[PDB]
Ligand binder design. Structure first.
Ligand SMILES: Cc1cc2nc3c(=O)[nH]c(=O)nc-3n(C[C@H](O)[C@H](O)[C@H](O)COP(=O)(O)O)c2cc1C
Lengths: 115, 128
């Protein structure tokens, strides 16, 4: 208990380790992801973007013929759970889910989101 | 995972093909280790430097963490006995040795083994 207690925080504060010797310290890491971890102090925005951006190219090439015009588009992206002029009168019996889809509209826009 | 590149086949669903299985596509990916070096994690300077210089190892040979240092990473057990993947520093390897020698023993053999190693134990603490 004296040895292993509270022993994660030195990775981030070697100024308080015996003589700032990292070699004394618990650092956590995976053996397989270790090979991909190389570029020091690289901004996180870059690492994440690097992945998404790279996926986007491979995907464009394979299934879009490198033509970005072929990518369908939509007002705003997201909000999907894994599952011309009219009048809706409402009663006790009207299904709530159905009702909102109507007022929502099919086109993805401000009115879609508003409902 | 660490890059868009090695991660891609799991998105295509093409990964499952190596094993004579229908394409088996995934919906997203998480990156735990890959980010530990980022400019904005609190990981200390000398620690980021330590992390990088670890040569990885293919899924081909991760099992070896249980025995030797493998790509500069060993497993070591917490106070509760569950496995932990740690960078194989001197302190960690002492922790591993004690894991195998001292903590290993029955609660009956504990205090005698400690006394018979007090000098050694006390020395290795001070060093590593
Ligand atoms: C230094 C470090 C600290 C972690 N802390 C937690 C935690 O508090 N809770 C949790 O559910 N997983 C935790 N994990 C597991 C990761 O979130 C993730 O499941 C795993 O790191 C992914 O493996 P990879 O680093 O090889 O990509 C941690 C992993 C590392 C390397």
């Amino acid at each position: 208990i004296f040895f292993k207690k509270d022993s994660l925080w030195q990775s981030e504060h070697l100024e308080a380790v015996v003589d700032q010797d990292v070699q004394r310290t618990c650092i956590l890491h995976g053996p397989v992801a270790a090979q991909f971890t190389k570029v020091i102090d690289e901004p996180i925005k870059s690492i994440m973007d690097g992945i998404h951006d790279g996926h986007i190219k491979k995907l464009l090439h394979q299934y879009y013929g490198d033509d970005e015009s072929k990518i369908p588009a939509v007002e705003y992206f997201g909000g999907e759970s894994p599952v011309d002029s009219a009048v809706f009168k409402a009663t006790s019996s009207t299904d709530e889910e159905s009702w909102f889809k109507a007022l929502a509209g099919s086109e993805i826009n401000w009115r879609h989101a508003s409902f | 995972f660490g890059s868009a590149d090695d991660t891609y086949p799991y998105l295509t669903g093409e990964w499952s093909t190596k094993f004579d299985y229908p394409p088996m596509p995934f919906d997203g990916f998480l990156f735990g280790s890959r980010v530990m070096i980022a400019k904005e994690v609190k990981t200390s300077p000398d620690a980021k430097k330590c992390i990088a210089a670890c040569t990885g190892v293919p899924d081909d040979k991760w099992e070896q963490t249980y025995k030797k240092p493998t790509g500069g990473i060993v497993t070591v057990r917490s106070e509760m006995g569950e496995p932990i993947h740690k960078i194989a520093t001197r302190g960690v390897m002492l922790w591993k040795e004690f894991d195998e020698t001292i903590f290993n023993l029955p609660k009956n053999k504990l205090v005698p083994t400690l006394e018979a190693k007090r000098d050694y134990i006390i020395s290795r603490l001070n060093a590593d």
